[model samples]
Target: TMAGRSMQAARCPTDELSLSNCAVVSEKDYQSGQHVIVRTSPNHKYIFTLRTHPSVVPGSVAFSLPQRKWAGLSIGQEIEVALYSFDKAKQCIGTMTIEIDFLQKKNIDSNPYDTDKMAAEFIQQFNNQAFSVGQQLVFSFNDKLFGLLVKDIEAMDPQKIEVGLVVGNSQVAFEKAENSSLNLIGKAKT
Candidate 1:
């Protein structure tokens, strides 16, 4: 499994206990026999998933997820496996310990040529995930027609949850884009 590689473990901070409390995921937990389910923080202010794991030590372990743009989107509807720990203050935290090269999660339309169809698909897919009218929708404007939009359509209101869209490129990449209109500020568009 991805945990085959060794990872550096950290301590969890106090105050937070749920999966959302983690900052990063360590290799220890990854290597260790543990599994967790990470979910978006309340209100989705930050696109992060809360990792829940068993404490190797009575105190706590330190865990931090990867610093990828869409931390929350990494693991779509499925429960992602993660390495986790608590901080010095015994706070819970973890990161995307193991990396999955394939974009199995995060229902993103990798096709750029079919942006129009993709946009529509995004809308339909987004609604299936979580979206509703009368709620605030934050969208990214890569151009005029190409972009991603996220809305707070859940029963409970998340802090700042937003979605992403594509206008120019088809597949998502780390390379910088020359399109000034493209808001490549990591997030799909907060």
Candidate 2:
């Protein structure tokens, strides 16, 4: 279950490069390179970062969090942001509200680049090929059990193709001659 409404955005550098009108609240003075957090309020948990410019000074009507870290942001997570205003004479600050609604995990399954379906298709194609006796068959897909393993194909006719699963770095043939059947070769391994 999700708590608050949050918007989903990719973690990149150019995603937040605009800050012209950030809803000014009060009047305060801040210098460049000041560490600030972008939460719902001034007393809330900071979510972003902001750096001031050199030479020219800007009034502290609203502060923006500049660069943010998003390494741990998984497929579905919620986040919120807001700005703060400050008064230089009275040392008082105001808050500007900005909320984001994050998406859930329903988007990853529909992704076109899902590796699960692609791996299954590769296995299906390999099984449909015509294997020859004593011929080597290589698995190219990145699967846990068959990432890069070679097996000796033994005894193949028009109907069935027999294969012997050869484990490890050795390349010895399971059958001594071409007259051996695939079922016999597969049974001899166990």
Candidate 3:
């Protein structure tokens, strides 16, 4: 059996921060009445009308979200979109997944502090010792006490030692732990 047919597959680049930066395979390949389905999670799916925009590339479509809805999404979340064909019977024909990156403007400082230097000083001042997982490290930063739980340690290179930590504030932990469980004899337990 021989037939004349063509098949093409293209991955849409979604790493760009905005929809304008994304592109699809080719606009000419897809016709009107098609839909673009976006899947953020297993339970979350959104359908949008796939239409070409003048500002975007010929193959890509533009998508916009309200500020309230946009704020709920976290940075680095994986979002998948797919193209579906609409047939005359109102049924979806072909479905193809489109890979895209979650883009968001982060407020974090790009220039990071030298934690390896700080660790070196801390080891020298507090007696040379190795940190263990689940150990708590308390320090003062900007006049605030911070508690960090050691989760991982890498000492492959002395100059580039890495310490993974779970950061938290001591004040919050104290507030959560504080409870009126005991009362003085003079005060009487109530």
Candidate 4:
């Protein structure tokens, strides 16, 4: 049976949590082909679909972000992976408004084809994970990275929450952000 304890931060999320840490399934049910959602935070503030992996540590499982990005994602601490009943996930539906903003204008480099590929990865890799409006997120695709968030989400007729399993036919918009150098040395710089 997969023990439901706080696990080491295994990377990042509405993203999937790997088997390298605690899972909601009983050891017997570990292999079950059903949805395994884990609220890997203190206050259900963060939730993720539990996947299977072997390269995870019991106390630490980092996400797929670059090492530099991981620390910035605030994933350098211990957190719990408690069971978030499937009922919440049951309402899982299609379409979402995700804003893929870059850390700076310099990183804002891509187009139709590249964006499409990133969308596929976000959909496939982080399947069933929850997305809360305005909640910041990080991801890298095709060697490109993003500092992003959900621009909007209408998880209608649910409990008091702005979170959702925003997947399938999602509308992902790439937003560019400020390129602060120590601070914006632009007009201020000459």
Best by lDDT: 4
Kindly give the stretch of ten consecutive residues in candidate 1 with the minimal lDDT sum.
92-101
1 against 3, candidate with superior TM-score: 3
Alpha-carbon runs more than 4 Å astray in model 1: 1-44, 47-112, 128-176, 179-190
Best by TM-score: 4
| Candidate 1 lDDT by residue in tens digits, 1-190 | 7532322234443323321323334343443323333433434422222344455332223433222233333422222343333222112111001111112224333322333443444444232122212112222223223222222211212122122212222122221123322223332221
> TM-scores across all candidates?
0.20, 0.18, 0.25, 0.52
- State the lDDT of candidate 2 residue by residue for 10-119, as single tens digits: 22222122222111221234432232333332344432223333322233223222212211332223334333322222221111111111112232222122233323
Q: Give the TM-score of candidate 4.
A: 0.52
- Tens digit per residue, CA lDDT, model 4, 69-119: 322334555654445654654355444555555545586544532445566
Per-residue lDDT of 7-91 in model 3, one digit per residue for the tens?
A: 2212333322222212222455454335545455567544434434334444333333321142233333345556633332212
| lDDT (Cα atoms) of all candidates against the true structure | 0.28, 0.25, 0.30, 0.47
lDDT of 4 at 58: 42
What TM-score does structure 2 among the candidates reach? 0.18
Q: Cα deviation of 107 in candidate 3 (Å)?
A: 34
Ranking of all candidate structures by their TM-score, best first: 4, 3, 1, 2
lDDT of 2 at 178: 31
